[PDB]
Amino acid sequence: MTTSQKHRDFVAEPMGEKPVGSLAGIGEVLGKKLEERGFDKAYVVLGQFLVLKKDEDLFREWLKDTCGANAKQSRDCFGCLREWCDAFL
């Protein structure tokens, strides 16, 4: 129910160079697969969200097909990345 404090902390201050696993919805195991995919930092992943014009269906299929994230974990990344943009873009 309550997103971990990271969700509010992430949309409360710049993302700087924090690691991908810092994004809400991405756990240490999942952050590792994206890292092997060339996404060693969160701003490279945010770029993907920007390239998908916030298409939620395209984003969710991209993350799931890219690492195998579940429907629950994709929802946290969508609202988490979408809310950061609302404050920083």
Next chain:
Amino acid sequence: MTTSQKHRDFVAEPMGEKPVGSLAGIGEVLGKKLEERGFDKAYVVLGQFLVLKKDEDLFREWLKDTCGANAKQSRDCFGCLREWCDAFL
């Protein structure tokens, strides 16, 4: 010598949904080729800059091979996109 007022105006306020041709260094003819390439808005182009980890050589070759921009026009987009990130990312 003096970048047009757009350069300072762009890094002085959010980019919102302004058209790609709004980025400094991209003229109306060049903005049109990127638009045919699927970049109808500036935030989709900024995403590409984020995906290239600000690699200036990779970015310049990408824009030139993508539309044919000259060495002068690529310099304006690099410093223009890079400075916006310094203020908004």
